[PDB]
Structure formats: C-alpha cells, structure tokens
C-alpha cells in the first residue's frame, strides 16, 4: 500500500513545531512541495485579536492566526488528529489576510 | 539612546531563519509582539509559481512567497540590510493570499 496521508486545508495535525496546528494550504500544494502552511494552537483564550477559539474540548484549542508558518510536514511528523470547523478555518484565514495587508 | 530598529513592511533583513528575508507585517504589529511575518530569499530564479524576483544584484534575491513564517525577530538577530521595491512587496503578498485561499 503506497498511499499516505497528505495534509489538507482544515486538518488539525499533531506537529513538532507551530503540538496542534491547523493546516491552511490545500492538498494540491501540500502533495507537491512537502510543505504546508499551518497555524499553531495554544491553551488559553485571551481575547487576543489574532486568536480563534476552536470548538471542542481539546487542551490546545485556541489557534493563533498570526503565527502562521510554512513547515516541512513530513520531517515534523504531521499526524492527523481531526479537523476544525469551516467557520473557524475561514476566521483564521481572514485574520492572516489582515496581517499580510 | 533607547530607540532601536523594529522591522517594517518591505524591509529586507538578515535573519537566522526564513539569511535574507522580506518583512510582510507592519511596524504596529512588529513593535508590540516581538514577531513579524517574513518570506525567505534564495539564489536561483526558476519560474516557480511562488517565487518573486527582487531587483538589485544580491546573491539571495529571489523571494519564496509560499515559505512565509512568523519569526521572533529579536531572537533571530534581525538586522536591516535594505528594502524591496513596493511592486515586489505587493506581488509577494498577492501570492501568499492565493496560498491562504
């Protein structure tokens, strides 16, 4: 069996850098480059302008949209934990767009 | 003298991670968080969809817009080397926006 998981947008993955992360880039990109864009999650909701609270009960369930980073997802050990809700993914993207200007 | 350089958008900085980088985030953000968004530069132009060739003659003068990353600019030693042209900065941002979707 040769096929293996490749992150897709909206995936919540366990990764060694920025442990939970939300994938923003699409499968077509992630499958060809070995990289994906992702946003790290942390524990505490603070009302920080760039945070997005994720539904569910996970320990690290606040995404920090401003700390987006390209990561080499194979080398960092990306394992899929689940997904975020579409509305959460869209709020993350909107906040990054504001930062990029 | 207490004031020190804080990156601003369009700055080309020498940084220890992703050596030359283009700053995308604005001073108001960079000055409060200790972080900025930046894109790494590399040597070779390949026609890669996410590359943006920078004017000038520097060794690492091709920005890889898809490898944007939040960096802790003080800890990575950000020193200003110069600037990129406005049109180059706008092409980088547009390419990141496509990746974010």
């Amino acid at each position: 069996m040769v096929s293996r998981y490749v992150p897709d947008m909206g995936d919540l993955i366990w990764v060694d850098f920025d442990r939970p992360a939300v994938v923003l880039s699409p499968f077509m990109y992630n499958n060809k480059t070995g990289m994906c864009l992702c946003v790290p999650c942390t524990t505490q909701s603070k009302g920080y302008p760039f945070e997005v609270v994720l539904s569910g009960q996970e320990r690290d369930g606040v995404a920090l949209a401003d700390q987006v980073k390209s990561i080499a997802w194979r080398a960092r050990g990306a394992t899929k934990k689940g997904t975020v809700a579409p509305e959460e993914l869209q709020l993350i993207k909107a906040k990054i767009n504001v930062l990029i200007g | 003298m207490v004031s020190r350089y804080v990156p601003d958008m369009g700055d080309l900085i020498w940084v220890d991670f992703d050596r030359p980088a283009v700053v995308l985030s604005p001073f108001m953000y960079n000055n409060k968080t200790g972080m900025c968004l930046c894109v790494p530069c590399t040597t070779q132009s390949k026609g890669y969809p996410f590359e943006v060739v920078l004017s000038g003659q520097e060794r690492d003068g091709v920005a890889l817009a898809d490898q944007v990353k939040s960096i802790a600019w003080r800890a990575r030693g950000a020193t200003k080397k110069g600037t990129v042209a406005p049109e180059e900065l706008q092409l980088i941002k547009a390419k990141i926006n496509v990746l974010i979707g």
């Binding site: 302008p49 200007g101 | 108001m28």
Partner: peptide, 12 residues
C-alpha cells in the same frame, strides 16, 4: 482592516 487595527491598538 481599519476596524481590526483599531481593536489591536486598543487591546495593547
């Protein structure tokens, strides 16, 4: 954009 950065400044 303008609303967002107003709120950011206010937060900090």
């Amino acid at each position: 954009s303008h609303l967002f950065w107003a709120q950011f400044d206010e937060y900090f």
